[PDB]
Design a protein that fits this description.
This protein is mainly alpha-helical and 994 residues long. The protein contains 38 helices and 13 strands. 18% of the residues are buried. Bound molecules: magnesium ion (2 copies). The site of one magnesium ion (MG) has 5 residues, from loops. It binds a RNA duplex (66 and 31 nucleotides) through α7, α9, β4, β8 and α16.
Amino acid sequence: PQHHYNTLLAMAFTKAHKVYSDIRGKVEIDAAQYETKAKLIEVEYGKDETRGLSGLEYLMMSKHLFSGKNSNIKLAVKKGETEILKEYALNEKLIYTVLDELRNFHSHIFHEPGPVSFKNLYGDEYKPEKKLTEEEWAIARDWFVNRFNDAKEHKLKTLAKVLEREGTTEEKEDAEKVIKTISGYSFEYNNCISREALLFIACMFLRKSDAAYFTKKWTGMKKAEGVFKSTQSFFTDNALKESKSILTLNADLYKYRQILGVLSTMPAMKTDSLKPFYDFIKINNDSYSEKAEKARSKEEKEKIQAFIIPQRKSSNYTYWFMKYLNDNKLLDGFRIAYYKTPEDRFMYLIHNGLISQDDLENIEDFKTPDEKLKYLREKGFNLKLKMKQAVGDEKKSLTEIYKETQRNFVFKVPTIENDNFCVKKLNVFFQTDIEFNGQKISVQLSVSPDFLMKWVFVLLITGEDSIKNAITEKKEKIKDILKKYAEEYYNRCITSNFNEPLMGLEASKVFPSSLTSTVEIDEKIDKDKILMRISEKYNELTKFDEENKSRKAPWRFASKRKIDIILDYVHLVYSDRAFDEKKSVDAMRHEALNDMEYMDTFEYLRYYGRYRETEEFKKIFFEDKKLYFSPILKAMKQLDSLEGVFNFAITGFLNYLKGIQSKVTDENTNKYGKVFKVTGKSLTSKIGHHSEMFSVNHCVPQELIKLNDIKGYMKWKHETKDKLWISDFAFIRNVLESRGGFSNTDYLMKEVMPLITFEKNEKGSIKGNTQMFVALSRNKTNELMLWEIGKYYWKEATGSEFSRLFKGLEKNTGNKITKAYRFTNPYYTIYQEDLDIKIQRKDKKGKVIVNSPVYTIKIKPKKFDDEYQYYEQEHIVDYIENYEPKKGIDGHWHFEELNKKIKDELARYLDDIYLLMTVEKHIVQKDFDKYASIALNKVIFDALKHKGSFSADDLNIYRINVLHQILQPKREKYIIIRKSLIEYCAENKLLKTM
RNA sequence: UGCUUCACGUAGGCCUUGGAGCCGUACAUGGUUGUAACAAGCCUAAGUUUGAAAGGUAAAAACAAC
RNA sequence: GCAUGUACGGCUCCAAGGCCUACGUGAAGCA
Ligand SMILES: [Mg+2]
Ligand SMILES: [Mg+2]
């Protein structure tokens, strides 16, 4: 029957078009691919895995790979996938148009369609909406027949593999009937596309459940195993499986996983007063490791090993704030400092016109950088001797070039694909442009890591990076304010106004001490500071000396510190002698170690045993550097291996430091102030020069961002009202803790702290009380911020918020841990706890109906990437409202079993629409003159078997319910209409012929 | 007697992240005088979640000589 | 007998995800 196949194909193509359009709504870079910037791994193909990708996976991987956010993340693909993905990305628009056309052609009521020609006629008065020409349709049809042939060949080979593998009498007859029909049908006929090809095309862009239903309804047969369950399974190797993740190449769940892995470990802070914490942690770790290396079962070992606390030696919070700012297309007007690459050095040398004297060596065959630089290094390119080998213009040019070369960071316009932010001592570097008297001046700012954190906090909480000004009202962006600060700093530096607040900042946090605190005449060095410096040096030297004689030093342990100590001792003795001998700066400079001599001396001392008889060592340490190395000539001659010369150096150093602590009076403080380099309190005569230096290259404090107008700030400020030492970070911690999160500070202060006793002070408090607490507080805040960023990336991956309640800890009341770290830390088990999602009626497009109920559904977090993307929540709200589902144990309306009931109702509705469409088609195809004399519903009602059971209104309600798939229970008036329709179908015997 | 769909275990592979150790490459920085600590780190307040002010120490960014 | 930073490649451990398989179960529908 042609009508049966036509209706089934119309339904299948409509479903395929709806599913395909549910993924793409806008352009999404279609037909504009430019390759992927990702390190592709050619992963081997799994055994016993059927080849072939559905159209949905083609679309998803074409979108994910050729996106732009995939910059260097080391994705995994199979063999021969990139070129076919490029072909699909080229012809996806044609594929979409072909699917839409085919759906429109098959879904016809008036003048029932015939077979689809090889040309796909689609014209004349029948279809005067020609959207595909001969060549475009030819390309799409060629792609389809290629895929059809590939699937047929793969299925035939898999079928042929069965007969060799043993088998019996029953197996032989089952494999014989299926090969002849699988190899039987073909894509091509006499200008007629076969029905099997159309079903294959329709099922290629569906899901496995709908494809299975359509294949089962394709042929009645006997409802048993359809041709050994092999012809029916021919069309389902495509039609994406569901319950299979589509976010493998998302590049936003990648950062979420990175953040989770970072947060799943305990920090190792370097505070002196936190040592008992880590001592207890080490003892516990060692004891439980020893206990775990005695087990006999996997489960017992897993239970024992849950008490071990992993640790990390450092954390990078400044990188994650900068990455968050770069992802949201912020900055955009600054110039960030990036790490220098060898390509950057090569390009700088090329543009600077310095390797132009390479006689055009044309080393372009190497292509990759860091090898051409190797060739110049082998050639004899040095660049470190070219500040004295040319006329006076050399100083203006080569010194600046050398200064640029020594810097290891470069300034570039920020980009999404750029990630190598320069982080030096937790700081970042920005470069802005200001206008003064109609001139563009570049200003460099060192931005603290707490400015960025407050910026990210303001962006995350309010949603906008705008801060309301205290005066003159109005809202200003945080991308701004920085530029105003730079301009005002420049203006104040020119005006020399360093005794008033800049932006209500109490200008000692800005304007460093060279400008805000000066004296007129040079100060007099006090007696106390020299003694303090001498005592500190003595204490450090004797501490290292005492610590050295415990590892027994058999030419091992630290050697750099020893060489530094010898060199410092020699230099200090030489300086003390030279000041008394009254030598000028140039006299001492020529009599000391320059760069080359210092490098040679360091190498010789590092390899002391290697050079003791070579003439180079004698020439350096006994001929040239005679006066400088005088205090050590006697020891170096009768010694070797450097382990004795270090002891002699430490002995001489300690003897000298003891011998000086009684030769420092008020009448000779100048000499040792010069020797130990203690200075005064700057000069007023050099205020202008320092202002000129500082007006361009200054720093940005973290108090520039004010959280006064954030929601809840006034209540928090009034609540405490007595913690005189409180700061703005307590507000951040309070806000982030009220939203749900975990930090290792909670575990440290509630599970480990009560078990240990701290060393007490003279007063009776904890020794090192202040800094320790600050340290702990610091950790908490940073960790909380990181978690927030992670949650943000979750919203960028699954499209839904992360709503979950984290349980709070309880203080320890025992003498043992009794609480495993891997069971207390929630980031270890974060994929095994239900999350909340809010479901609301969507109606048409992105328009949530106000004053409508909102439902809360609990869903496992491993179902957010497979069977939650593009789910058509209208079915969920229809099932919740129209039906009356029951709430199970801990009643919360789980997404599971809701999916199951919804799928069952969808199958029932599919049967209903098939039946109604067949009956409507038969009714219309006959009484065309009667219909042409809504009135169509009245025509159907008159041409039926109703007496008093239902009116035209009931038929209309049934038709709108069935056509649009509004999920409702069976009720009563629906059953009689279905019985009448079945009676009509059986009376004419419409679907019983072969 | 069985059929598919989910979910949980058990055992394998094949990839990708996170911490720690042993490593190796490859590159950059390292010297003597003065100017230079606004930014970041360390030490000082409370036996429980208080980074404000103050006192030391501290050379990350910068300027000029060999 | 060397310190810091950067990028890469290993080995070694732990852990987390994703894809394939092969055995058990638990549940929903169908013959
Ligand atoms: Mg999943
Ligand atoms: Mg302070």
